[PDB]
Design a protein around this ligand. Structure first.
Ligand SMILES: [Zn+2]
Ligand SMILES: [Zn+2]
Ligand SMILES: [Zn+2]
Ligand SMILES: [Zn+2]
Lengths: 148, 151, 114, 1134, 227
DNA sequence: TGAAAGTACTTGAG
RNA sequence: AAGACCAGGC
DNA sequence: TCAAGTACTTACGCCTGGTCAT
């Protein structure tokens, strides 16, 4: 069993009203390549950035690709969660998650779930139950050539 | 054996100890140290056993099967060996030290319960206390096994 | 990453969103105080928790007689021969048996790992 | 001025000085003296004055007075009571307690009349023997022998109704100290606790828990690495969030709470961990609403808001961490300490501080005689005041007057102390189940070593049936504090522990001078402290109470150590611990801390110089003692948690010298490493050459060895007393046996022992004894049995009289012979008495006479040694008859060396039959060589070799454990100088044939012990004797002529044999056989009149169809009990 | 008693699910010779009902709750009328309920009427063990000692006589309830002195009484230590 | 100071 | 008269 | 239907003896 936590180095929730601003200067080079083609861009996207950095060793030891993590996140959280991955070649692996609104217009006011705490709840849920690989209840698998 | 343990400790202190898969760094360090100490005690036991004449009475009662084993001969003559509590070396009961007589973070054989002396030679005070700690576990197991096995 | 307190009632500030100017704000939930964020980062979680333990080491540990000391590793700052070394002495240290060295002699208090 | 290579003499000189100044029971003596001199007065004063009301009556207790133990003979005549008189007459060696009482009245006439009641008797406190208030204090050996008291008797026990009771030290977790643990399956990830007691002045303990709620979601807030700290205050139903507790203390803003919790705001991880706790308590933002929230979850919610607020405020002020404070403005101090607890919890959760372990003896305290008696006396004095108040309230409603002398019932204190010391149930008699049992054991007088072990013994209050192996393990912190070898093998392994020889237990001190010095030495009180200046500073704890912070900890510790070394302001009991990593200085003055003396190493040199040794060598007529050594700053008492911060040298001349460097910062040195052993483990020669279980077995066996247990055994009327004919001091001895008084009172004989296989009768663990040696007195012993009997007047005309019954004057009578009794019905000494003979003739007047005489225990066959006649407490006739029996060692008696080699006597051969050397030497004992190899008692072999060397040389061999100067090769070379083979082997000749034995035999004088366990005391045979009244099955016990139990395992074994008939015999025929008549219609038993043959079943009107059924009587009893529970176990024969 | 109460209509002795119903027929076919499994299956069926109708009557059933030795009935969703949704369900009420359960209906519950009827599980006539079960101890012949069972029986007789005298005289209708509670405690503590949450019977000197259950329960008991 | 493991009941949650 | 506790044995 | 609570139980074999208070 490999959750997202097993392969994440650090996870930070930023505030980016404009993706082209890219408060992290290291992410500006590649984030502009994804907003040329708009997922929903212009439609109001949550200005909150769930930025997760993936450990290189813990991810190469499992032959995990950031595309696989993106697919898992999409499957587990529906289309209302944009996900972008930097690159395999990049010295540090970066995953950026937003909370794209439905944007259907008009259509429970108390049921708001503020995006700042919603991102934190989503991050906790991802780090606890992402099940990127393996079978639940299988904590650790040992591999050896028997002598007996 | 003590020099080998010192070399392993130096490798661990210099981050040169590569962790064996399925084990942590502390776990692989303890595995290496226990391997060295067990190999040392086996070698010393073999040396002590080969030195016994045909008139030796320990060997007489061992080869007959009446009482005793080769490990008893090794501990009497060569080396008592490592003393373990709960299957591990003697724990750091004090802050990062087994006894007040040792410096902190002392993972050498002497501090963690390896009795270099034999029963004929006699144990040092630290070895005496560590041997008492080791035999206490056997006494507890003896006193506690009876009820569960009877149930 | 840090926590900012109110300048009116000294209560904890919570981040809030400015719909008009699109700027992060820290707004008190006990009164009407607001302020502009400078760091722009709200939450930081380090799963690998790779933190330099030298920040959590006190220079006074050089006064402990129960810790070992060697002259083989001199201090980087003052070049003092004596130095006291110790392991992590910390839980959740991942897998590390490395040594942390603290310089002896008063008022230097240099801490380094090698 | 140093002691190089002369260290062996010097260390044992300082140890001899220590044991001359202190002794072995000094812990108990000091604890009891502190209880009497300080604790009783403090308990009496701390009791609130009796306020009653209209006139008002006030009662105040000023000062308590103790006297010597005196006996009020019947009439009342006061008289000094000696301990031997207490033992003989079954008296309680106790001293009356008088307290001055002031009674004031208020008549509303502007004049209050106060009456002072000087020396008002309130009860008798049992006095520990040889204590300050005992009559044996300060008496010389001649004075002690004049009172028939053994000079070697250490004292330290109480005499309750003649029986000698010893209070065992009860372990407890150290109070006022914050402990953080992590339970496995609990709802709390980490739990911090602090058992707080207010300077032991009042209230037992109030425990506060600060715990962090696991890891799963707390509904809507926890989305991080593990959070939601909660608190469990006493007298509150359920959990209260910690921020609400802080707001109930007057701190409303989050910054104040965090400053009291987090000391450096530059640390983001801790603030992140504490944030959701703030989030949970976001709704509560005022002090009063927090108080209301706390009060609403109390024992019973208040009707209105204000009473709830007052109740919560009272709970927080009094019952929440009372050791921090209990009065008014202590809210700031309580907030600081609660924040410290939360800080510790966060550090444990963050992984920055390791979790505390319960087995660390620095985290443990030992409740000696003093604290235990204080705990009992506090409750007893409270009950006495309650009864005085009840009496006064009853007598004041009339308004006539009030009397204090009749209002005080001294019986309450006297009987409470006497009962709790007698039965051992520590608590009220009505609450015996809630009372801890096992305290105050009966003092073991089997051997002097046994008495010393019982007087130096510790107890873990945890349950013996518990299978948890960790508390039973030998913790590293027990070094020099608790003997690693002496542990009760069995259900108390690791739990009952014994003190090391040098171990001392702190008696307690008031931390007023320490606090005054801390204020006078700058420091900074918590009230005057700005929280911004607390991260860099070091917290100063005194008895757990955080008193302030100090910015220069090195200088403070140096000054405190200097003061304790000079004994100026800090007494030697006080422990001072500096946690450098955690920036904490902990100072402890409380009682119960276990400490041992250690030499002080400054630079790399001992402070113990040659001049100290020279002065100690002349200890007599010099007034130079151990106290002078301590007052000179050479030795220091260090307890376990201070021993954490010490750097110890095992030996000076080996570890402080310059070599390949391991440690150069040694701060202390061991006086001698052999001091880690207790009383019973210090009689082992060469214990470091034995397997540790064998050392434990010998430690257990030494208390069972027989010698001269006490010198005044002639005056003692003790049941089950064993004395040895010819005790000998060991030829191979330890340097500690001098301080154990083992040479004076030894239990064993140096026996020529051959480790050989002679005729097969020493196989397994058995031994072969020399019959001729046994004839010459070898290991002969005497058994003393004392019989107590008492005349009494119970009925209106019923009475007991000691008299010799005639053939027909007594209704009951036995076939025994009463001709040995005298005119008083007591057999005179010198009369040989066999089994069934009458010891004391007593008659009971039946409302003519009924025989209540006492007979010998079966098959004793002894001779009456001494008969004592006296008057007991009630003044009735009281008799103690001691019967002596000489017990020659048979082939069933148990013998053991000092190495765990126990065994019975397989057979006895005479001198001609025993194997003999060329010099005619025949071994007194022959033990099998097979007992050695697996059990690995090499110390036994080395003891034999050294004893052979010493007997031929004329010295006494030195077998101190870690000598480095006594090797086996040196002993062999010494033996070779006396015409013997160096390894101890000697050529033996077969006794029967005169032929040489092909293998040469290892022969030498080895010290052996005769154990209490003898075959005659253990041999039993049953053939259809007494049966139980209820079960109608054979009685239980060898003494009651009982039958052996054929238990469930035996039944299973016979089932496996398929022996149905033998199983039926054992479980039906051999035990109770019975017949019942059951109805045939119903299965219920029927009325059966066998003589009239009228069988009737009430319920069926069945007189014809009734069957006879053979069943065990226990089965009929079971069926009748089931019918008593409305179950119908209908036995159907159809 | 509680389980049987949950399987029957209060104040209308009738199985909540009828025997003619196919489910009860299946339970009887599967549970021939296994009365305990029959009762547990019927209890599982009847715990999910809240009205006595297939059969007869029809009235909302209570929720039986135990508090120590007392039973309380919670009549949630009652019509109106008498209401009183918190009664103290007395042993007398349960006895009258069980006396009217027919032999067939109690047989479906697994209680064979000729061996055990539900109302017999309520103590109306208390058995008194013979003198053999509770022997008297002779102390020199001057005084006679008694067993713990004899002392508990003395307490039961005292409280029973007090209750009977108050019933004859009339009393105050709440001292009657106190006497009933005390008699229930004594009777239940004679049988078992190890019930959680209840005070233990102490004859004197603060020693708990050894009940019949304690006589029979563990090792050193009757079956383990005497048979 | 410090048991753990199973289960039957009981309760909201579907 | 048989319970509680304690100590012990193997 | 479920599943997560919470109450509630249950582990020593034989043997010895002593003492204590009912
Ligand atoms: Zn504010
Ligand atoms: Zn430096
Ligand atoms: Zn019948
Ligand atoms: Zn109905």
């Amino acid at each position: 069993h490999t959750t997202l936590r097993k392969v994440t180095a650090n996870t930070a929730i930023y505030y980016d009203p404009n993706p082209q601003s890219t408060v992290v200067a290291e992410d500006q080079e590649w984030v502009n390549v994804y907003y040329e083609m708009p997922d929903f861009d212009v439609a109001r996207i949550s200005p909150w950035l769930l930025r997760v950095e993936l450990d290189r060793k813990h991810m190469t030891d499992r032959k995990l690709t950031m595309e696989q993590i993106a697919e898992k996140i999409n499957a587990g959280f529906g289309d209302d969660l944009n996900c972008i991955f930097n690159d395999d070649n990049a010295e540090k692996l970066v995953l950026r998650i937003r909370i794209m609104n439905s944007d259907e217009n008009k259509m429970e006011v108390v049921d708001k779930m503020d995006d700042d705490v919603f991102l934190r709840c989503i991050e906790s849920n991802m780090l606890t139950d992402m099940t990127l690989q393996g079978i639940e209840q299988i904590s650790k698998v040992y591999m050896h050539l028997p002598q007996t | 054996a003590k020099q080998d343990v010192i070399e392993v400790i130096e490798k661990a202190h210099n981050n040169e100890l590569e962790p064996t898969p399925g084990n942590t760094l502390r776990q692989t360090f303890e595995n290496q140290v226990n391997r060295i100490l067990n190999d040392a005690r086996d070698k010393t036991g073999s040396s002590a056993q080969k030195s016994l004449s045909e008139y030796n009475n320990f060997k007489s009662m061992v080869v007959s099967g009446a009482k005793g084993s080769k490990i008893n001969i090794s501990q009497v003559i060569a080396v008592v060996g490592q003393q373990n509590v709960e299957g591990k070396r003697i724990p750091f009961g004090f802050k990062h030290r087994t006894l007040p007589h040792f410096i902190k973070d002392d993972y050498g054989p002497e501090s963690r319960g390896f009795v270099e002396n034999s029963y004929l030679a006699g144990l040092t005070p630290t070895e005496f206390f560590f041997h008492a700690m080791g035999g206490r576990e056997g006494l507890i197991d003896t006193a506690v096994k009876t009820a569960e096995t009877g149930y | 990453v840090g926590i900012r307190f109110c300048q009116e009632c000294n209560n904890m500030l919570y981040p809030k969103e400015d719909k008009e100017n699109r700027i992060l704000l820290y707004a008190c939930r006990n009164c009407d105080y607001q302020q502009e964020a400078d760091n722009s980062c709200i939450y930081v979680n380090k799963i690998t928790h790779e933190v330099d333990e030298l920040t959590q080491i006190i220079a006074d540990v050089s006064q402990d007689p129960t810790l070992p000391r060697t002259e083989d590793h001199p201090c980087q700052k003052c070049g003092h021969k004596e130095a006291v070394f110790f392991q992590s002495h910390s839980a959740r240290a991942e897998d590390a048996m490395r040594l942390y060295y603290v310089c002896t002699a008063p008022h230097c208090g240099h801490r380094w790992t090698e | 001025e140093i002691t190089p290579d002369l260290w062996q003499e010097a260390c044992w000189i300082v140890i001899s000085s220590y044991f001359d100044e202190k002794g072995l029971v000094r812990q108990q003596l000091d604890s009891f003296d502190e209880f009497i001199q300080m604790s009783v007065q403090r308990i009496v004063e701390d009791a609130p004055p009796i306020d009653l009301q209209p006139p008002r009556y006030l009662l105040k207790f000023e000062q308590i007075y103790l006297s010597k133990p005196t006996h009020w003979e019947r009439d009342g005549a006061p008289s000094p009571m000696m301990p031997n008189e207490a033992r003989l007459r079954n008296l309680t060696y106790s001293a009356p307690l008088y307290v001055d009482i002031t009674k004031t009245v208020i008549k509303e006439g502007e004049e209050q009349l106060q009456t002072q009641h000087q020396k008002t008797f309130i009860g008798k406190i049992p006095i520990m023997l040889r204590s300050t208030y005992c009559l044996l204090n300060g008496l010389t050996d001649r004075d002690l022998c004049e009172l028939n008291e053994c000079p070697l008797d250490p004292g330290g026990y109480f005499i309750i109704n003649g029986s000698e009771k010893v209070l065992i030290a009860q372990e407890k977790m150290a109070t006022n100290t914050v402990y953080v643990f992590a339970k496995k399956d609990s709802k709390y990830a980490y739990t911090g606790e602090c058992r707080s007691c207010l300077e032991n002045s009042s209230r037992p303990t109030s425990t506060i828990w600060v715990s962090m709620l696991a890891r799963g979601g707390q509904g809507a807030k926890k989305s991080a690495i593990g959070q939601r700290i909660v608190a469990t205050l006493p007298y509150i139903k359920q959990e209260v969030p910690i921020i609400i507790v802080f707001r109930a203390l007057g701190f409303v803003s989050d910054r104040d709470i965090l400053e009291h919790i987090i000391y450096d705001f530059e640390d983001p991880e801790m603030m992140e961990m504490v944030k959701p706790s703030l989030d949970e308590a976001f709704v509560i933002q005022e002090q009063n609403v927090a108080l209301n929230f706390i009060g609403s979850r109390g024992a019973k919610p208040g009707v209105t808001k204000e009473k709830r607020i007052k109740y919560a405020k009272e709970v927080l002020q009094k019952e929440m961490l009372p050791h921090v404070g209990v009065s008014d403005f202590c809210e700031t101090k309580k907030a600081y300490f609660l924040g410290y607890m939360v800080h510790r919890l966060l550090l444990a959760a963050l992984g920055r501080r390791e979790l505390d372990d319960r087995d660390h003896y620095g985290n443990k305290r030992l409740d000696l005689a003093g604290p235990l008696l204080a705990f009992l006396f506090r409750g007893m004095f409270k009950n006495l005041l309650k009864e005085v108040r009840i009496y006064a309230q009853k007598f004041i409603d009339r308004g006539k007057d009030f009397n204090l002398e009749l209002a005080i019932k001294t019986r309450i204190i006297s009987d409470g102390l006497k009962y709790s010391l007698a039965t051992g149930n520590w608590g009220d008699q009505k609450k015996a189940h809630q009372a801890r049992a096992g305290v105050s054991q009966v003092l073991n007088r089997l051997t002097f070593a046994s008495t010393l072990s019982h007087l130096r013994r510790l107890n873990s209050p945890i349950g013996r049936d518990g299978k948890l192996a960790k508390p039973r393990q030998l913790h590293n912190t027990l070094w020099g504090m608790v003997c690693p070898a002496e542990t009760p093998e069995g259900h108390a392994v690791g739990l009952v522990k014994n003190l090391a020889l040098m171990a001392y237990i702190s008696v307690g001190s008031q931390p007023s001078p320490i606090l005054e010095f801390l204020e006078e030495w700058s420091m900074e009180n918590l009230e005057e402290i700005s929280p911004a200046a607390i991260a860099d500073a070091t917290k100063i704890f005194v008895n757990g109470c955080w008193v302030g912070i100090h910015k220069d900890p090195e200088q403070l510790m140096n000054t405190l150590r200097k003061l304790r070394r000079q004994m100026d302001i800090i007494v030697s009991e006080v422990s001072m611990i500096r946690d450098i990593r955690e920036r904490e200085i902990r100072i402890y003055t409380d009682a119960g801390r276990i400490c041992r003396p250690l030499l002080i190493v400054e630079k790399q040199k001992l402070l113990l110089k040659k001049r100290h040794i020279d002065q100690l060598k002349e200890r007599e007529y010099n007034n130079y003692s151990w106290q002078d050594l301590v007052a000179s700053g050479v030795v220091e008492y260090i307890d376990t948690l201070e021993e954490e911060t010490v750097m110890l040298a095992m030996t000076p001349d080996d570890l402080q010298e310059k070599e390949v460097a391991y440690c150069s910062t040694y701060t202390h040195c061991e006086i001698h490493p052999s001091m880690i052993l207790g009383v019973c483990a210090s009689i082992i020669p060469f214990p470091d050459h034995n397997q540790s279980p064998r050392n434990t077995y010998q430690s257990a066996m030494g208390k069972q060895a027989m010698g001269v247990y006490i010198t005044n055994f002639h005056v003692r009327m003790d049941t089950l007393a064993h004395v040895l004919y010819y005790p000998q001091k060991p030829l191979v001895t330890t340097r500690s046996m001098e301080y154990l008084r083992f040479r004076e009172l030894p239990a064993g004989i140096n026996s020529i022992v051959a480790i050989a296989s002679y005729t097969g009768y020493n196989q397994e663990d058995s031994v072969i004894m020399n019959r001729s040696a046994v004839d010459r007195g070898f290991f002969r012993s005497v058994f003393y049995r004392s019989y107590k009997e008492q005349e009494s007047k119970k009925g209106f005309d019923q009475e007991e009289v000691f008299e010799k019954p005639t053939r027909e004057t007594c209704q009951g009578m036995r076939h025994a012979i009463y001709d040995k009794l005298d005119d008083d019905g007591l057999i005179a000494p010198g009369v040989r008495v066999s089994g069934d003979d009458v010891i004391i003739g007593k008659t009971v007047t039946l409302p003519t006479k009924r025989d209540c005489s006492t007979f010998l225990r079966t098959s004793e066959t002894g001779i009456v040694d001494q008969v004592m006649v006296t008057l007991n407490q009630e003044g009735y006739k009281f008799c103690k008859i001691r019967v002596r029996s000489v017990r020659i060692p048979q082939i069933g008696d148990k013998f053991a060396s000092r190495h765990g080699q126990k065994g019975t006597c397989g057979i006895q051969y005479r001198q001609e039959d025993m194997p003999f050397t060329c010099e005619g030497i025949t071994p007194d004992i022959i033990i099998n060589p097979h007992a050695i190899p697996s059990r690995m008692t090499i110390g036994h072999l080395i003891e034999c070799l050294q004893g052979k060397v010493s007997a031929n040389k004329g010295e006494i061999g030195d077998a101190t454990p870690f000598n480095d100067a006594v090797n086996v090769q040196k002993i062999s070379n010494l033996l070779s100088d006396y015409g013997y083979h160096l390894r101890g082997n000697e050529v033996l000749y077969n006794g029967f044939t005169g032929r040489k034995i092909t293998s040469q035999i290892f022969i030498g004088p080895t010290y052996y012990q005769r154990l209490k366990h003898m075959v005659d005391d253990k041999i039993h045979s049953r053939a259809r004797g007494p049966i139980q009244i209820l079960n109608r099955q054979p009685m239980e016990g060898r003494s009651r002529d009982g039958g052996l139990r054929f238990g469930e395992m035996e039944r299973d074994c016979q089932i496996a044999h398929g022996a149905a008939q033998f199983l039926r015999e054992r479980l039906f025929e051999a035990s109770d056989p019975y017949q019942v008549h059951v109805c045939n219609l119903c299965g219920i038993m029927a009325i059966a009149n066998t003589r009239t043959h009228t069988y009737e079943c009430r319920g069926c009107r069945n007189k014809t169809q009734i069957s006879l059924v053979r069943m065990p009587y226990a089965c009929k009893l079971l069926f009748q009990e089931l019918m008593s529970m409305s179950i119908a176990p209908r036995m159907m024969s159809v | 008693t509680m389980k049987v109460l949950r399987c029957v209509c209060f104040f209308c002795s009738k199985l909540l699910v009828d025997s003619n119903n196919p489910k009860i027929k299946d339970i009887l076919a599967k549970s021939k010779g296994q009365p305990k499994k029959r009762l547990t299956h019927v209890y599982d069926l009847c715990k999910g009902k809240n009205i006595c109708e297939h059969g007869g009557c029809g009235r909302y059933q209570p929720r039986i709750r135990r508090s120590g030795l007392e039973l309380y009935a919670e009549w949630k969703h009652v019509n109106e009328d008498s209401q009183e949704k918190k009664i103290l369900l007395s042993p007398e009420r349960v006895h009258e309920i069980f006396k009217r359960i027919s032999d067939e209906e109690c047989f479906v519950l697994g209680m064979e009427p000729r061996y055990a009827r539900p109302e017999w599980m309520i103590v109306t006539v208390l058995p008194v063990p013979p003198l053999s079960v509770r022997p008297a101890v002779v102390m020199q012949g001057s005084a006679r000692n008694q067993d713990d069972l004899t002392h508990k029986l003395a307490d039961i007789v005292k409280i029973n006589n007090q209750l009977r005298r108050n019933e004859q005289n009339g009393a105050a209708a709440h001292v009657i309830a106190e006497d009933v509670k005390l008699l229930q405690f004594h009777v239940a503590t004679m049988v078992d002195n190890e019930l959680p949450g209840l005070p233990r019977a102490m004859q004197k000197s603060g020693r708990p009484l050894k009940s019949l259950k304690q006589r029979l329960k563990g090792k050193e008991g009757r079956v383990r230590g005497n048979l």
